[PDB]
Scaffold this active site. Structure first.
Site, PDB file in Angstrom:
ATOM      1  N   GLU A 154       0.406  -1.282   0.296  1.00  0.00           N
ATOM      2  CA  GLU A 154      -0.386   0.123   0.057  1.00  0.00           C
ATOM      3  C   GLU A 154       1.078   1.163  -0.145  1.00  0.00           C
ATOM      4  OE1 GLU A 154      -2.485  -0.876  -1.128  1.00  0.00           O
ATOM      5  OE2 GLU A 154      -4.511  -0.848   0.123  1.00  0.00           O
ATOM      6  N   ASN A 184      -6.413  10.692  -5.568  1.00  0.00           N
ATOM      7  CA  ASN A 184      -7.497   9.110  -6.618  1.00  0.00           C
ATOM      8  C   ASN A 184      -7.868  10.002  -7.888  1.00  0.00           C
ATOM      9  OD1 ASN A 184      -9.831   7.008  -7.572  1.00  0.00           O
ATOM     10  ND2 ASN A 184      -7.640   5.885  -7.178  1.00  0.00           N
ATOM     11  N   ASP A 187     -11.709   9.625  -8.187  1.00  0.00           N
ATOM     12  CA  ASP A 187     -12.437   9.144  -7.545  1.00  0.00           C
ATOM     13  C   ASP A 187     -12.384  10.769  -6.950  1.00  0.00           C
ATOM     14  OD1 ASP A 187     -10.604   9.216  -5.648  1.00  0.00           O
ATOM     15  OD2 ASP A 187     -11.210   8.284  -4.421  1.00  0.00           O
ATOM     16  N   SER A 201     -11.119  11.126  -4.696  1.00  0.00           N
ATOM     17  CA  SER A 201     -10.890  11.504  -2.674  1.00  0.00           C
ATOM     18  C   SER A 201      -9.379  11.072  -2.486  1.00  0.00           C
ATOM     19  CB  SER A 201     -11.423  10.429  -2.286  1.00  0.00           C
ATOM     20  OG  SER A 201     -11.142   8.930  -2.392  1.00  0.00           O
ATOM     21  N   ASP A 227      -6.171  10.028  -0.935  1.00  0.00           N
ATOM     22  CA  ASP A 227      -5.845   8.572   0.303  1.00  0.00           C
ATOM     23  C   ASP A 227      -4.459   9.268   0.833  1.00  0.00           C
ATOM     24  OD1 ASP A 227      -7.101   6.865  -1.850  1.00  0.00           O
ATOM     25  OD2 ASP A 227      -5.342   6.816  -2.997  1.00  0.00           O
ATOM     26  N   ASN A 248      -8.453   7.421   2.003  1.00  0.00           N
ATOM     27  CA  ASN A 248      -9.037   8.126   1.693  1.00  0.00           C
ATOM     28  C   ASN A 248     -10.225   9.931   2.316  1.00  0.00           C
ATOM     29  OD1 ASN A 248     -11.154   7.024   0.546  1.00  0.00           O
ATOM     30  ND2 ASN A 248     -10.816   6.578  -1.648  1.00  0.00           N
TER      31      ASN A 248
HETATM   32  C1  LIG Z   1      -1.563   0.668  -2.975  1.00  0.00           C
HETATM   33  C2  LIG Z   1      -2.080   1.978  -3.124  1.00  0.00           C
HETATM   34  O1  LIG Z   1      -1.947   2.946  -2.639  1.00  0.00           O
HETATM   35  N1  LIG Z   1      -3.888   1.468  -3.691  1.00  0.00           N
HETATM   36  C3  LIG Z   1      -4.882   2.387  -3.644  1.00  0.00           C
HETATM   37  C4  LIG Z   1      -6.188   1.928  -2.635  1.00  0.00           C
HETATM   38  O2  LIG Z   1      -5.995   1.946  -0.846  1.00  0.00           O
HETATM   39  C5  LIG Z   1      -7.567   2.962  -3.242  1.00  0.00           C
HETATM   40  O3  LIG Z   1      -8.299   1.916  -2.810  1.00  0.00           O
HETATM   41  C6  LIG Z   1      -9.857   1.994  -1.817  1.00  0.00           C
HETATM   42  O4  LIG Z   1      -9.921   3.400  -3.536  1.00  0.00           O
HETATM   43  C7  LIG Z   1     -11.700   3.181  -3.150  1.00  0.00           C
HETATM   44  C8  LIG Z   1     -12.496   4.302  -3.842  1.00  0.00           C
HETATM   45  O5  LIG Z   1     -12.151   4.163  -4.991  1.00  0.00           O
HETATM   46  C9  LIG Z   1     -12.358   2.935  -1.395  1.00  0.00           C
HETATM   47  O6  LIG Z   1     -12.373   1.983  -1.109  1.00  0.00           O
HETATM   48  C10 LIG Z   1     -11.095   2.877  -0.482  1.00  0.00           C
HETATM   49  O7  LIG Z   1     -10.689   4.319   0.207  1.00  0.00           O
HETATM   50  C11 LIG Z   1      -9.713   2.627  -0.638  1.00  0.00           C
HETATM   51  N2  LIG Z   1      -8.876   1.919  -0.324  1.00  0.00           N
HETATM   52  C12 LIG Z   1      -8.951   1.439   1.308  1.00  0.00           C
HETATM   53  C13 LIG Z   1      -9.588   2.410   2.446  1.00  0.00           C
HETATM   54  O8  LIG Z   1      -9.295   0.365   1.317  1.00  0.00           O
HETATM   55  C14 LIG Z   1      -7.044   3.417  -4.390  1.00  0.00           C
HETATM   56  C15 LIG Z   1      -8.484   4.287  -4.657  1.00  0.00           C
HETATM   57  O9  LIG Z   1      -7.799   5.670  -4.080  1.00  0.00           O
HETATM   58  O10 LIG Z   1      -6.365   3.595  -4.762  1.00  0.00           O
HETATM   59  C16 LIG Z   1      -5.626   2.258  -4.514  1.00  0.00           C
HETATM   60  O11 LIG Z   1      -4.216   3.135  -5.843  1.00  0.00           O
END
Ligand SMILES: CC(=O)N[C@@H]1[C@@H](O)[C@H](O[C@@H]2O[C@H](CO)[C@@H](O)[C@H](O)[C@H]2NC(C)=O)[C@@H](CO)O[C@H]1O
Length: 129
Positions: free
Chosen positions: A35, A46, A48, A50, A52, A59
């Site tokens: 992560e 992201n 989205d 939102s 992180d 996020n």
């Molecule tokens: C490795 C890394 O940074 N992965 C990112 C994820 O954490 C992230 O996943 C999830 O995004 C969703 C919204 O688009 C949400 O369910 C949640 O906030 C988030 N992870 C959680 C909270 O478990 C995505 C989206 O930003 O980015 C990936 O790259």
């Protein structure tokens, strides 16, 4: 901060994640490298919209208040800047709460792919615990 393999994650057992709430202690350390790659200040926005926060990669859309997420719940009720700092003493309440949702890691993206169905004892192996 920059944490080593055996020195970033010995504090999860200090936070009670050892076998905590249906997920065993061994299933945990693997994902953090997936992560934020054992780094607390690696944060990313992201598509989205939102943004992180932390090695947790949480996020502001659903989980916290960064002032830029409207229609955001912030059911976590804390500054998203509250976890990127060297001290993470309380940082685990939401990682914990994010599981009672009845979904677990269903929110975590990488683990479900990079750590799901993997050899996890290998990630926690050789260290003292
Ligand atoms: C490795 C890394 O940074 N992965 C990112 C994820 O954490 C992230 O996943 C999830 O995004 C969703 C919204 O688009 C949400 O369910 C949640 O906030 C988030 N992870 C959680 C909270 O478990 C995505 C989206 O930003 O980015 C990936 O790259």
């Amino acid at each position: 901060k920059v944490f080593g393999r055996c020195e970033l994650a010995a504090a999860m057992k200090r936070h009670g994640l050892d076998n905590y709430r249906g997920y065993s202690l061994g299933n945990w350390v693997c994902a953090a490298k997936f992560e934020s790659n054992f780094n607390t200040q690696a944060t990313n926005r992201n598509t989205d919209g939102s943004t992180d926060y932390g090695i947790l990669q949480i996020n502001s859309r659903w989980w916290c208040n960064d002032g830029r997420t409207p229609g955001s719940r912030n059911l976590c009720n804390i500054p998203c800047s509250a976890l990127l700092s060297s001290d993470i003493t309380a940082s685990v309440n939401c990682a914990k709460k994010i599981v009672s949702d009845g979904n677990g890691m269903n929110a975590w993206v990488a683990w479900r792919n990079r750590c799901k169905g993997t050899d996890v004892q290998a990630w926690i192996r050789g260290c003292r615990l």
